[PDB]
Amino acid sequence: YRIXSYDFXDELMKLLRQAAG
Amino acid sequence: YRIXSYDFXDELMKLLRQAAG
Amino acid sequence: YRIXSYDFXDELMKLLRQAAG
Amino acid sequence: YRIXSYDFXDELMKLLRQAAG
Secondary structure (H helix, E strand, O other), X not given: XXXXXXXXXXHHHHHXXXXXX | OOEOOEXXXXXXXXXXXXXXX | OOEOOEOHHHHHXXXXXXXXX | OEXXXXXHHHHHHHHXXXXXX
């Protein structure tokens, strides 16, 4: 799930975890 | 849009901006 | 915020609203 | 990744796929 060079998939997974402490 | 005291809405909006840069 | 002709931004905003109902 | 009864994780995964046809 990439937007050009950005790995949106990865950043979103990190956010989900960060918000579910 | 928060999960507990985590500002998920905001962080997601920041990801959409970064991904779009 | 689109992936090709898919309006991802919009659909995501709709998910945030539904999840918050 | 739940918001009350809503499975945000699941809906978001479906959206990612839908936008990556």
